Write a protein that binds this ligand. Structure first.
Ligand SMILES: CC[C@H](C)n1cc(C)c2c(C(=O)NCc3c(C)cc(C)[nH]c3=O)cc(-c3ccc(N4CCNCC4)nc3)cc21
Ligand SMILES: [Zn+2]
Ligand SMILES: [Zn+2]
Ligand SMILES: [Zn+2]
Ligand SMILES: [Zn+2]
Ligand SMILES: [Zn+2]
Ligand SMILES: [Zn+2]
Ligand SMILES: [Zn+2]
Ligand SMILES: [Zn+2]
Lengths: 355, 517
């Protein structure tokens, strides 16, 4: 369904573990994506005739950092984009590509950080999934740690991925403990945190802002996959999540007809709705992605086959090229779902266009 | 088979419309914003990109990020103050009632109550209440009387005052027609060399059911104060005073207070000094102390999870790979583990020339690990102790590992008695019982929270514990319709030999004063 038109390579030959198109792009403005890897984030623009233009690049002060992921977000009242990046050191920098300086930084995660996402309806709430067994909900606007997901009933091993739902009401996480845990965020207890995290003021009250430790998930299960889980994205009220088993799996928790907004924590049954079967992809940390209207599903593997899927099976169309050789860590479509950028282990990029 | 294939797509397509209708509102919110794009940098060492397909190789300057001070490694743990043990009948209150014996109406209470810590299905003591520890017209109104004939004996004009729905003498017709301590129990047998306490080399405590003057019970001490030198047999036996026995030193005086006359009970009350977290001067996270501490003064209870020796053996496999063990031997049979749940003091690093030491003292049957100062400690030293014997700076928060600036580091003390996760976790464990009815369940939840809110640790306190429960939570008792189960709770308290008889009369009196209002 696609067609490749360009290939790239950087100057460090180190792996790149994620890319995102800034889906907050304007209407009629050029498509822009960003690349994390090594100790450096590189931003890129698209142009006519398969030209990929190099915009700007930022390197962190020490070469020991190994960035893993990134995600875009607009400012509320300044209209600039912000691209938060986090890696092995567990620090989350912001780095706006307008003034080109580390505008904010948040220390204090217990280990590395393995995935980042933003709330869909609030561009001020940032969720970080960490190796320290816990998820954390930051607040870019007001410099406040809202929550910590993972206490006694939290993720007992290393956590690797999560994703908000579509409307922005219920997070779902997973990690190297074979578990997928739903943490709703529409309860009035999580909501009065988001409210009071704005009306907090450091020099207005000699009392640090009360961060909400969530010890008990709103649902948990280890019945879907066998070994570790390294990716997870919502599907509205269904959930896709893969493992090193050469298969992305669809599933809803509870019974078939039991609504997701009424399933209470102690529910133990699932309903596996099927699997997307693929081949040769079976190592640590290999995500997928989906376009903005969620008809596409793109995954890469270790030898360079760049799978695609039609999500309206109401069709294992593949993408392969003679030089696409190393592994594919992550893919990301453009907002209008026209360009598919994939990154590799040998510090290379590939640009695919739909027709 | 043909049925489930058809339910997949009917739900898929209904789920699909949910995708469409939601994704539009995000798209509609996208047409609201006019956000600027990314543009190249000509303002400013250099990065370069080549193309594997015939295209000019592009170079731009490399904008360096300012360095950011990293923090040491820390894994997800949960706040704790009192230890945590780990493993390796119709309702008589509302519309549907029944008439059962004395033991069937109270069955869940005798088995689910803990004689030692005063909570239902506690978290420390796994063994249930030993047998003789709990022996000292509709269907509901009649099953109540059935409970009282074992408790209220032959008083007729008073039993009618309780049940309220009938009157005095008409009742007649019903009458017509180093090892861990566990309480020892053996009727018709004295506490001899066949007793678990004697076999374990442990003294029987107040919880034992052996004879009152059993030759194995620890008696307590008669000191006037301090209890802090070899002179006091409580101290001399490596024990904290028993606050139902040592009435002279102060372990039973001013339970609200934290600095009592008796100084050898600072663990059971939780009078632990203030601890602060910061990066260690060796490597990693370390703990420092806020205010100065004398020689041989109590710092904190080293707290954690209680695991078996067999569970400690499996966890010693996983712990060995990081060269970092956080477990300590509590006694021969049990081990404490601060890796998953612990308190602030679990951040004391090892050193062979330390200023603190660990003493495994005994508190009301429970062996606990106390941390004490080996010498005097002044403001801002990092506390160390030797792991072998038991197995102007930047301060950080405990729960979040964020910087705790000096503005409000005085009465913070992020270490209460009842944490938020336990107050819920005990509710999880009450409801999960499938053999207990939910009318009795919704009262034991109220008691467990009341106990933890005040911090009760003495048998003598239980008169005030049941009288304070009515003053605060009795309103939720009537609104949730549990006034009858609350009476069952009282006669279960009275069956366990730790409440006064006139308090059961005084407690119901204060409930009915608000009920008829
Ligand atoms: C199987 C689990 C494993 C055994 N485990 C459990 C815990 C609770 C824990 C921690 C941890 O909670 N610590 C905080 C801390 C405490 C609590 C107390 C003190 C005195 N001090 C501290 O720091 C850290 C590490 C770990 C691993 C590798 C590592 N290295 C790699 C980078 N280069 C330096 C060496 N560093 C630390 C392992 C842990
Ligand atoms: Zn107990
Ligand atoms: Zn009478
Ligand atoms: Zn005994
Ligand atoms: Zn005995
Ligand atoms: Zn005895
Ligand atoms: Zn004494
Ligand atoms: Zn004493
Ligand atoms: Zn004493």
């Amino acid at each position: 369904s696609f067609k490749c038109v360009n290939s790239l390579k950087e100057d460090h030959n180190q792996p790149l573990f994620g890319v995102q198109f800034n889906w907050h792009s304007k209407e009629g403005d050029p498509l822009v994506f960003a690349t994390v890897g090594s100790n450096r984030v590189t931003l890129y623009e698209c142009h006519s005739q398969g030209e990929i233009r190099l915009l700007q690049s930022y390197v962190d002060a020490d070469a020991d950092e190994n960035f893993y992921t990134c995600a875009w977000t607009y400012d509320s009242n300044t209209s600039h984009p912000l691209l938060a990046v986090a890696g092995s050191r567990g620090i989350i920098r912001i780095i706006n590509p307008i003034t080109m300086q580390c505008i904010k930084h948040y220390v204090g995660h217990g280990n590395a950080i393995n995935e980042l996402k933003f709330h869909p309806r609030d561009p001020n709430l940032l969720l970080s999934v960490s190796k320290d067994h816990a998820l954390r909900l930051w607040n870019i606007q007001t410099d406040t740690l809202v929550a910590i997901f993972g206490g006694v009933e939290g993720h007992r091993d290393e956590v690797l991925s999560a994703d908000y739902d579509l409307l922005g009401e219920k997070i779902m996480s997973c990690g190297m403990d074979h578990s997928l845990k739903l943490w709703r965020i529409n309860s009035k207890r999580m909501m009065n945190a988001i409210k009071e995290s704005y009306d907090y003021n450091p020099n207005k009250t000699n009392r640090p802002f009360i961060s909400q430790k969530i010890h008990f998930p709103d649902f948990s299960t280890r019945d879907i996959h066998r070994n570790y889980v390294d990716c997870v994205r919502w599907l509205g009220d269904l959930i896709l999540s893969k493992s090193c088993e050469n298969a992305i799996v669809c599933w809803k928790p509870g019974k078939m007809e039991d609504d997701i907004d009424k399933i209470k924590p102690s529910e133990s049954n699932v309903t596996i709705l099927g699997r997307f079967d693929y081949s040769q992809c079976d190592i640590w940390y290999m995500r997928f992605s989906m376009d903005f209207w969620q008809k596409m599903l793109a995954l890469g593997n270790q030898v360079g086959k760049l799978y695609v899927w039609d999500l309206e099976v109401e069709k294992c169309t593949t993408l392969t090229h003679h030089k696409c050789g190393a592994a594919i860590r992550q893919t990301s479509f453009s907002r209008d779902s026209s360009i598919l950028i994939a990154v590799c282990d040998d510090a290379s990029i590939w640009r695919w266009d739909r027709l | 088979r043909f049925r489930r294939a058809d339910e997949v797509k009917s739900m898929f397509s209904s789920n699909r419309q949910k995708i469409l209708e939601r994704t539009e509102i995000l798209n509609q919110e996208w047409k609201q914003r006019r956000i600027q794009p990314v543009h190249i940098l000509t303002s400013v060492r250099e990065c370069s990109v080549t193309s594997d397909l015939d295209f000019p190789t592009q170079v731009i300057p490399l904008k360096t990020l300012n360095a950011v001070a990293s923090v040491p490694i820390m894994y997800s743990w949960s706040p704790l103050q009192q230890n945590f043990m780990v493993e390796d009948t119709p309702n008589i209150d509302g519309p549907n009632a029944k008439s059962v014996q004395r033991e069937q109406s109270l069955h869940s209470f005798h088995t689910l109550f803990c004689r030692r810590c005063f909570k239902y299905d506690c978290f420390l003591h796994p063994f249930h209440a030993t047998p003789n520890t709990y022996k000292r017209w509709s269907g509901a109104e009649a099953s109540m009387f059935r409970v009282l004939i074992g408790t209220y004996y032959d008083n007729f004009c008073a039993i009618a005052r309780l049940i309220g729905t009938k009157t005095c003498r008409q009742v007649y017709e019903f009458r017509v027609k180093v090892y861990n301590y566990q309480p020892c129990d053996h009727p018709r047998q004295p506490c001899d060399s066949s007793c678990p306490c004697v076999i374990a080399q442990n003294f029987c405590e107040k919880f034992c059911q052996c004879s009152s003057e059993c030759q194995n019970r620890f008696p307590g001490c008669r000191c006037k104060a301090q209890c802090n030198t070899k002179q006091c047999p409580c101290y001399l036996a490596v024990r904290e005073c028993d606050p139902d026995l040592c009435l002279t030193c102060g372990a039973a005086d001013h339970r609200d207070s934290k600095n009592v006359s008796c100084k050898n009970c600072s663990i059971q009350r939780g009078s632990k000094k203030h601890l602060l977290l910061a990066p260690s001067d060796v490597a990693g996270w370390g703990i420092f102390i806020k205010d100065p501490v004398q020689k041989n003064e109590f710092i904190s209870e080293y707290c954690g999870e209680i695991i078996s020796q067999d569970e400690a053996d499996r966890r010693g496999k996983v712990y060995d790979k990081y060269m970092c063990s956080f477990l300590f031997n509590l006694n021969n049979d049990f081990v404490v583990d601060a890796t998953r749940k612990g308190n602030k003091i679990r951040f004391a690093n090892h050193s062979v020339n330390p200023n603190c030491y660990a003493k495994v003292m005994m508190v009301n049957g429970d062996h606990r690990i106390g941390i004490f100062a080996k010498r005097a400690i002044q403001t801002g030293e990092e506390l160390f102790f030797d792991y072998r014997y038991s197995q102007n700076r930047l301060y950080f928060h405990s729960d979040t590992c964020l910087p705790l600036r000096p503005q409000e580091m005085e009465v913070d003390s992020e270490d209460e008695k009842d944490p938020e996760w336990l107050r819920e976790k005990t509710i999880t464990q009450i409801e999960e019982f499938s053999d207990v009815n939910e009318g009795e369940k919704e009262v034991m939840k109220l008691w467990n929270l009341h106990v933890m809110k005040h911090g009760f640790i003495a048998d003598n306190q239980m008169n005030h514990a049941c009288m304070l429960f009515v003053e605060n939570y009795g309103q939720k008792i009537i609104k949730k319709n549990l006034c009858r189960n609350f009476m069952l709770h009282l006669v279960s308290m009275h069956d366990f030999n730790l409440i006064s008889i006139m308090s059961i009369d005084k407690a119901v009196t204060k409930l009915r004063e608000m009920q008829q209002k």
